[PDB]
């Protein structure tokens, strides 16, 4: 539900 708001770098 909640969206990824940090890069795939972390």
């Amino acid at each position: 539900a909640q969206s990824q708001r940090a890069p795939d770098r972390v």
């Epitope: 909640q2 969206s3 890069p7």
Partner: antibody, heavy 117, light 113 residues
């Protein structure tokens, strides 16, 4: 200097396919997620797909899932949207927008997809 | 799944008037990280939308100071403090906290002349 340029739009028969391309420029492309957002003529904005940073997470709108595939080539600085089984309901200006990691801050000028016989 | 409702859908105001556009959520837009991903867009005729405000109240680079944002949880607000002729457009709120990402319907601002 940040720019996103959509191409590959056009006329398609219903049931037909297109591959949209978004050529990124003027930032580190590999650092950001990229979204597609579409706007049917005279209508509001509809989000359709997102590919993360390194492609780990991918989101589709229900309206689009199963038919549209979002992909990216970081070494080419290009994003793609493969659109299969096009209905008339898909006629729209399709925008590629870079995501800050908090907001879609830079959008391209758009490419129009007209599904028609 | 978040329904974004704007008020009004359109309006006419004179130059120099204060204009308020309302956005309503069906669900809190506070993320797990404590941030609230509500953003506001301006779309002029045959041009892509431009980011005006991000995270409720942050004015995007190059956005004039007469555009501001406000709100928490469910109810948010865009203010144009002194409306200018170039401010003619459709304004959209959007959320990025949950998937799907969703926009409001738009609020068309017309300048009364």
């Amino acid at each position: 200097e940040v720019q996103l340029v959509e191409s590959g739009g056009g006329l398609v028969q219903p049931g037909g396919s297109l591959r949209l391309s978004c050529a990124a420029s003027g930032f580190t492309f590999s650092d950001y997620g990229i979204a597609w957002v579409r706007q049917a003529p005279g209508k509001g904005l509809e989000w359709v797909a997102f590919i993360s940073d390194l492609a780990y997470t991918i989101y589709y709108a229900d309206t689009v899932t199963g038919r549209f595939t979002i992909s990216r080539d970081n070494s080419k600085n290009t994003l793609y949207l493969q659109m299969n089984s096009l209905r008339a309901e898909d006629t729209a200006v399709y925008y590629c927008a870079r995501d800050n990691w908090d907001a879609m801050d830079y959008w391209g000028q758009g490419t129009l997809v007209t599904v028609s016989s | 799944d978040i329904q974004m409702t704007q008020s009004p859908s359109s309006l006419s105001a004179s130059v120099g008037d204060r204009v308020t556009i309302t956005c309503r959520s069906s669900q809190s837009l506070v993320h797990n990280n404590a941030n609230t991903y509500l953003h506001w867009y301006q779309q002029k005729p045959g041009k892509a939308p431009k980011l005006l405000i991000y995270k409720v109240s942050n004015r995007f680079s190059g956005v004039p100071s007469r555009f501001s944002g406000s709100g928490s949880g469910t109810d948010f607000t865009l203010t144009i403090s002194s409306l200018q002729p170039e401010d003619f457009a459709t304004y959209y709120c959007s959320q990025n906290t949950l998937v799907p990402w969703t926009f409001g319907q738009g609020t068309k601002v017309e300048i009364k002349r």
